[PDB]
Design a protein around this ligand. Structure first.
Ligand SMILES: Nc1ncnc2c1ncn2[C@@H]1O[C@H](COP(=O)(O)OP(=O)(O)OP(O)(O)=S)[C@@H](O)[C@H]1O
Ligand SMILES: Nc1ncnc2c1ncn2[C@@H]1O[C@H](COP(=O)(O)OP(=O)(O)O)[C@@H](O)[C@H]1O
Ligand SMILES: [Mg+2]
Lengths: 352, 352, 141, 129, 141
């Protein structure tokens, strides 16, 4: 039986928090994708279409994490790539067919199962054109990449070299069809909020006769992104033909201080549990007080590092203990509190 | 007997709605092509020559769809290519002769069948000079591709591997003449309206004696495209020698709300029919009210993504529904109405 | 043959010597007949060295084809495959001289008129002493 | 490895995997041994400003599977290619940030470097650094 | 030997490992004498690493050749077939250690003066009390 969206959402909830809307889109898409593969026979005349996802969210919001948390349960081959590396054909940077090559590695270079795989494309924001470009330079890193992906996303046969090879007149190619291969392009469209802010509150005129009734409101970047439409992406620099390939769009809100605290303990692969297990094997228990978790989140927000910064904060706080704990003896358990975070007091050590 | 153009149009209109002009050119060309194959003896003093086609149209207008539908009834082999992949000879990108190789694969590498096959070159607009006639640096991915295709469309003795490169020694490259191979190029020329508008429009000035034109009474994209001429394409970036190989030009107009509504239910593989069958296997019926379809057409036009915009509107409406639909029990039918499109209401769920 | 597919030797693209290979096939790989053959290198205008281009770069698609063809047009011995079978172990280079082979090159030079006009007019300017024609009295392409 | 060597920005994928290939030579081309190896880099300040080079570098640190040929050879098929996960490899991105000290003094110490009251004691001692 | 001829293993150019075999030929394939032998790799600068070229399939000559030579300096026994062994393997593989074999690389690094000068050239001042450096006594290799 194909896993229902609730089951898929539960797995994402275990590793991801605060992205309920994003999980639903990916969960239903994965469920619908399995149904299409399950309905691969297609006895009925109707031909099931394919819908791609476009994850737009700020950096450090778990866009990449959502993709990594699916490979664990995903039955079909799944891979991750970077759009920045991709370049237009005929240039020294790269080619777009390498994406299929990465997918081929996971499937044991079997095109049959590869056709039913799912693909993820990171950092798609860098491919957008900046503005008012005549194109005389023949931009390769940007517009050129989009033009090549168009046929790939909708579905076209692609010649993929066997391994570690570049396209050439040689016959070392593998015909792979991307019609049934799902694509999830995820990127942090920095500056898109300003475009959305403009259209929503551009206003009309500046003088006495102008209409300034519209009042600019202070809203979070995640809240504003929900009002995004395809017209906004065109101004950002994306080709209209590209958005048509990505009908479904899901936006992720920025993490808050309270969410950071939850991420420290609630996730199954929580950062706190990693250090605890590191100490448990040695034979010394480890415990983190809620007083320290609040301070840890404040430091990350103060430095704007985000969720990634949590690792650095924990490393510094436990640097002294980790160095001395293996050599030391008679340490049954260690207790950490807010006093450890600021550095005024060393972490409390319990003796047995 | 060869199918008449009317018969060919009957099959084409089943999947394509509103592209009357495009169907006539394709049907006449296909019918004329079959006559030339039946006239292989060529007893007539005159030697029949082929006429190529150039399908211009905006996004989601049915350009690529027409090619896929035509292959269903094409007796001769048919293949689809991507202009972006093609590059000038002597570079990492794929060469133009590879297109003939793809056609050969379809007909078991039979030179006789390949010589009478039909070819489609999607994304032909991508290979265009970027408004720089001197072209300081060689545009292998752009202008270079056109030069390679100049002699191929009219006819050239292409060289390709015998059978998918079984063994590189003793290649004995197959000789294939493309003099009788029909070519159908197609692409969305973004910005061509600006070129045609300058020529057709009277112009504007600032002084007392000049003529001022209001923004309201201005030519539309569809109106300008109808007046497209070869001189206009040259300014866009195409080479004059290239248009000469494409005498027949068939433009596609933008889909209207009435056409979009018909596309949702009239064709064999529509969005409504897709989701309908998607839910039939699950055991729940799907019913789309007529008023809802009309609302979707209006919302799609705002997206400016063509027919592909319809898929985004439907997915957003049924996103939450599909998430909870499998866990629900005995849901015999679901109904969607205009109140669900805007979002004020939720789709009705009937329990048996 | 078409000059577009040709490129400088040592690269993935077809070499200029392959032109003789095509000629040999017409005469059933007869060296004597090949020497009396006629060639038509179409699209010759496409292989043109860009006077405006980065200095440190090799224009294999352009000037590289012209440089390699210099000996092929004046006359030289070119090594070609043995026959249609393309026997790799056997040397059989089938040395054929190109001193008695005529090469009728042809191409549509786009923009050449603008270059010729610069030398012919010699009157463009803005002042009283300049020559303005309005493009109606200017010479045709 | 050195960042200046990989700042080419053309086909960066083949050089990042080439580094582990160099590492594989020392470990007898053992995937398990290669994963436990320690990689070092230096002169990271130079790339900071190519921005694109950093996009490819972070993937290698975050973790990526790179295919490598099996102990060289004349040629080998895609099946024989050895894939080593970089997630288990320790990466040390060394660098020398000469101008970063001024940035820290501006943030932590007084934001005056030119005036009479500023600290321009460029004695070359660098003890405060 | 000369680095110019050397190319990556498995390619039409040459293989670096044959250098040890060439040394053994001089002393009739005796490992004891070979270990005390000296090697001179002329034209070492010609194999300097270069950036990738789209037209070229692969850069066989360059850093890839430097890795093979570097392996011998690190110290590794090289398997060499003695007395010109036939194609049959026969498991001879005479092992000759490269740790004791003196490795000398002599090449003319043309253009190195430019990079060195940019680093060690102080520059010319403009004031009255500055030191002006004429092109005559500017610098030399
Ligand atoms: N006339 C039409 N009738 C029915 N469905 C259509 C029509 N035009 C578009 N569609 C739908 O929209 C999808 C995309 O249409 P395409 O023809 O691929 O658009 P397009 O002309 O290829 O745009 P490009 O080439 O990417 S700029 C099709 O698969 C259909 O589902
Ligand atoms: N809810 C969360 N729980 C745990 N980790 C999170 C969460 N949200 C974000 N992260 C962190 O974000 C990182 C991945 O995000 P990243 O790859 O930076 O996204 P992008 O590259 O798209 O900006 C991971 O290291 C992960 O620890
Ligand atoms: Mg299309």
């Amino acid at each position: 039986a194909l896993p229902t969206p609730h089951e898929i959402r539960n797995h994402l909830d275990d590793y991801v928090i605060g992205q309920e809307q994003a999980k639903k889109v990916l969960a239903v898409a994965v469920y619908n994708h399995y149904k299409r593969l399950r309905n691969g026979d297609t006895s009925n005349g109707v031909e099931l279409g394919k819908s791609n996802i476009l994850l737009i969210g700020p950096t450090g919001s778990g866009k990449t994490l959502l993709a990594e948390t699916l490979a664990r349960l995903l039955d079909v081959p799944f891979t991750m790539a970077d759009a920045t590396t991709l370049t237009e054909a005929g240039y020294v940077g790269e080619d777009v067919e390498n994406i299929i090559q990465k997918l081929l590695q996971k499937c044991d270079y079997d095109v049959q199962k590869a056709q039913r795989g799912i693909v993820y494309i990171d950092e798609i924001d860098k491919i957008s054109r900046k503005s008012d470009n005549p194109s005389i330079t023949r931009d390769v890193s940007g517009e050129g990449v989009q033009q090549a992906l168009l046929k790939l996303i909708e579905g076209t046969v692609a010649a993929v070299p066997p391994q570690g090879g570049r396209k050439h007149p040689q016959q070392e190619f593998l015909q792979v069809d991307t019609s049934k291969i799902l694509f999830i392009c995820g990127g942090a469209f920095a500056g898109l909020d300003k475009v959305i802010s403009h259209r929503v509150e551009t206003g009309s005129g500046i003088g006495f006769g102008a209409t300034v009734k519209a009042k600019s409101d202070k809203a979070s970047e995640g809240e504003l992104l929900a009002q995004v439409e395809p017209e906004d992406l065109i101004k950002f620099g994306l080709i209209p033909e590209f958005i048509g390939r990505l009908p479904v769009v899901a936006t992720l809100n920025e993490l808050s201080e309270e969410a950071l605290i939850q991420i420290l303990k609630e996730p199954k692969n929580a950062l706190t549990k990693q250090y605890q297990a590191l100490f448990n094997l040695e034979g010394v228990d480890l415990e983190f007080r809620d007083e320290a978790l609040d301070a840890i989140a404040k430091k990350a927000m103060a430095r704007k590092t985000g969720a990634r910064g949590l690792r650095s904060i924990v490393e510094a706080a436990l640097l002294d203990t980790m160095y001395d704990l293996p050599s030391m003896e008679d340490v049954e358990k260690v207790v950490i509190d807010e006093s450890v975070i600021d550095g005024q007091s060393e972490p409390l050590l319990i003796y047995g």
